[PDB]
Symmetry: C5
Subunit: 208 residues, 5 copies
């Protein structure tokens, strides 16, 4: 009754009484940490050169305007909110061939220090030539993820590790993973001074 | 026509629960919520051995109880229950953990609410999931499994339960391409090294073969 | 001179939706009779590899509410109007053995008449559980699918038919499948747990390949 | 400057300061003219008897509540409005087998005489037996269009011509058109006094040489 | 800490543009709008020779400039640009004239508004359009065209422009099933015999063959 009431006031205080977050700027840049858990390569189509992945995409960011003291809110350390109610980063695959499909409830975890955890399970079709998938060496494909409309001066993309998490990879998949990495890259365009950041998902795989 | 206010009793109750009283914010560590899950498997529609995807049609029965949805029937003209759209109330975020396509809803998104604050929600769903159908064309059949759980709440917040570990097969389609050899729904508690909380799932395991 | 009749309709619509409380749904104390019927237009596809059959049909739903009654005399002799089916309560009639979500072919609009009647006839495409074995035989294949409220008992929503004959008079003459018979039959059950009756309408179709 | 401002004032006046048209009635019937531009026959499926067409469906009607004198609003003669913000006619294919797919932005054109022009590009699957499509005589198929919920006492459906517009039919289509007509038909049902109108699109087509 | 001021600055800017003074209501004959259109071709995914449809992935670049979106950076803590959801602003109704399926959008629907009042919006899209792939498996390839333009505005209302007649091929997928022989984007002034006013489109001509 008290625990339940304190949360209704907390969400209210952050979401109603406080004017919300309009996004990162040059003066107030934002670090977004990114990491992948690869669950299944579902299909590799050699007549269109599309491959279908199911993965979990972990997204982590921190905000002052989502900080609070648990002492003023009944020891409440964390809460759940719909991703629609808050700002989320516009991380996008740069070479998908169909719109991403979301497999999970679009819900994020907000902790008292202002950090936000958002992990949507997704199915992506993307550009990939599976030539060699039927051999010892397998095939190698790559896809880039990054912000659609922010430079590296507004959203800094970062990984916690270069190793894609394969500890939940489906053991009875048509395809087995020889290796899977996630590398931060800095890209410039000749028009412009800003750096642009993406994370390169490289997967090497073969028929099992 | 003066039962008109049994309609108005239903209108009043709905105000007193939704409009007068604050939003149910979901469960917390101090205010945990038991959710009972059960499955009625209606059909294995397709088994795709080129992608290792199998498609099921089932009813997913969900049931939880909230104090904030309780009322005295005598205070509302002896009304036992009502219906609301699932959009208009909090519902548990139960998710298959190995789906390959977004879940497709086959039934109207309506929940039943009872005077003791109990809520019943039974969406019919079509699900594609990760499954190797090898051996479906033999006596022994294929065995496949899919885990269901909350996406964002631990066992400290959502106490996921079952009433029985036997999947309800009594309205399983008699002319399905696939006959069911067995269907179990097993609750599983897991602990990780990082974290104090238990993590609960319900494992749905189906042994099945091509109808002979 | 037709500025006034437009005004009367605006006034009527307002009086029923804005100035009165809307219909909250049926109860045990205030039950609702819903009449159901089917117009079978086409059997599109019969998949013997997954045991699904695809139908296009019109689903006639009719019910009456006191809260939607008016005197035509009070509103420039207007006897009916049209409304979007999302602005009003509609019954939760569902196919009990569909395999994919229903696809709506028609504009979601209902007809409301001055005696409180609502007429709602969506055109739909349905995939449902069906074994078409014998479809090229003389006897044909036989398939069945039940329709009823998802969340209301017989004591709350009473399902009714006007006829057991499915309307076959617009059945597509050059379909892949000819209809040998199509019936719609109200059935009643009681479950072991409870005293309430449960109603469904059984759409039974016998069909075979057109030669 | 000025031009924008006059546009905003006009749309306000029609949409906010005047009550909008609530739909046609028996006492206030409405003429809708309908016409087709056939772009392409994409697919003929003989295992299900379905054909897919792409076409432009031209719809036109005229409303007193959308008239204005151009001198009253800085010489503005027309504007555009999302089709969701105005009443539009419920014209449906009577024999589609899948929900019709919209290909163009849902924007209508309103002119000072109160006439509305709405031309959605659409992909349609409808019931059609393509037998004989590979012979010289071709296959013949037909689909009816009409209001779903209004009789001919409420919406008077008309055409401007019975000849379908073939001037932008895809020149490299899998199928060539032999003829395409659109014909107004008036029915009567024993149940009721009102007349019922539809427009019947009849297409004769065959595989290209 | 002074990041609170730039956040406050941004919010007042957005507030002053979206709350004080309404929509730009669209272009008129008296106030016509220039829209600059460009294409980044990324992939020819498939060429169905059974239906004569071809599927493209590309980035469509759209530029326009409005006085109603213009500001002095000095009054807003030197903010020179921001991001908006494309829904919260007017955008041009640029359509493919010969699509066979609704365009599918692959990127988030966000635009970039700069202080000079110019808006930049670049949707990634997958398009199915009318194309005959005959000759694709020969050395000289197949050629297909699709026109893009406004659906409801004449050239007196929207002036469609390009910066170059060469499609950007620098991000074209190197392992596609199809290689690009050439890709041009040409601004065309059409005359319809009903009407004196001109109509503008951008014609995307792609010459391609099997890699394969
Ligand atoms: C919406 C857009 C770009 C969408 C396409 C795109 N977005 C992600 C990033 C921002 C860029 C560099 C790569 C992309 C996404 C992936 C790719 C390619 C595809 C391939 C897999 C790859 O790695 O890069 C391109 C070409 C896009 C880049 C442009 C389009 C580029 O021409 C945009 C230029 C670069 C610099 C600039 C000037 C102004 C600015 O405009 C862009 C957004 C940021 C902003 C405001 O600084 C406008 O960026 O405009
Ligand atoms: C949104 C998420 C995780 C979603 C993915 C996920 N969810 C269900 C449960 C919580 C976990 C264990 C399984 C999953 C869904 C199913 C699986 C795998 C897939 C396979 C079928 C299986 O059995 O487990 C994983 C790997 C997810 C787990 C993570 C991702 C995991 O690394 C998250 C860790 C575990 C403990 C913790 C610390 C904080 C916390 O963060 C998560 C939510 C609960 C919360 C607040 O306690 C954040 O959870 O963060
Ligand atoms: C949301 C639901 C049930 C949806 C599933 C369902 N609905 C239609 C009716 C209500 C039932 C009998 C059949 C169904 C839909 C069709 C079928 C099967 C499938 C096959 C095609 C068929 O004909 O019957 C089942 C198994 C459902 C029934 C249950 C699930 C059943 O266990 C529910 C029991 C029966 C009576 C009762 C007690 C309380 C109550 O709860 C249900 C709603 C009515 C209500 C308040 O009386 C809760 O219903 O709870
Ligand atoms: C929503 C509906 C019917 C939808 C189905 C339908 N609609 C378009 C028109 C109105 C009718 C005649 C043809 C249809 C759509 C096309 C067809 C068939 C299909 C084939 C391709 C064809 O050409 O006609 C039918 C069978 C529908 C007709 C009925 C269903 C019919 O039984 C309905 C009767 C006819 C007269 C009447 C009485 C009252 C009234 O009710 C209808 C709406 C108008 C209204 C108020 O006058 C209720 O219409 O109700
Ligand atoms: C919404 C529409 C037409 C949509 C179809 C269409 N739109 C883009 C442009 C405007 C036209 C010329 C080409 C189109 C889209 C592309 C094509 C074809 C398809 C092929 C790839 C091609 O190159 O042209 C046509 C035939 C459309 C044209 C008509 C439909 C045309 O008959 C409409 C006439 C032409 C001039 C006029 C008079 C009034 C006016 O009405 C139109 C809108 C502008 C407006 C107000 O000036 C009404 O335009 O109406």
């Amino acid at each position: 009754l008290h625990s339940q009431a304190n949360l209704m006031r907390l969400k209210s205080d952050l979401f109603n009484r406080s004017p919300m977050y309009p996004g990162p700027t040059k003066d107030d840049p934002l670090t977004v940490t990114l990491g992948f858990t690869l669950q299944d390569i579902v299909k590799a189509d050699s007549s269109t050169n599309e491959v279908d992945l199911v993965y979990y995409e972990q997204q982590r960011w921190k905000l002052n305007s989502l900080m609070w003291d648990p002492n003023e809110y009944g020891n409440i350390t964390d809460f759940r909110t719909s991703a629609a109610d808050i700002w989320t980063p516009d991380i996008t695959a740069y070479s998908s061939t169909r719109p991403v499909q979301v497999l999970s409830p679009q819900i994020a975890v907000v902790t008292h220090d202002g950090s936000v955890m958002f992990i949507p399970a997704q199915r992506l079709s993307f550009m990939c030539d599976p030539t060699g998938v039927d051999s010892e060496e397998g095939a190698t494909c790559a896809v880039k993820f990054g912000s659609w409309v922010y430079s590296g001066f507004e959203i800094d993309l970062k990984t916690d590790t270069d190793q894609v998490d394969l500890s939940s990879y489906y053991a009875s998949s048509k395809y087995e993973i020889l290796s899977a990495t996630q590398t931060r890259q800095v890209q410039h365009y000749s028009c412009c001074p800003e750096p642009y950041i993406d994370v390169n998902l490289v997967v090497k795989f073969r028929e099992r």
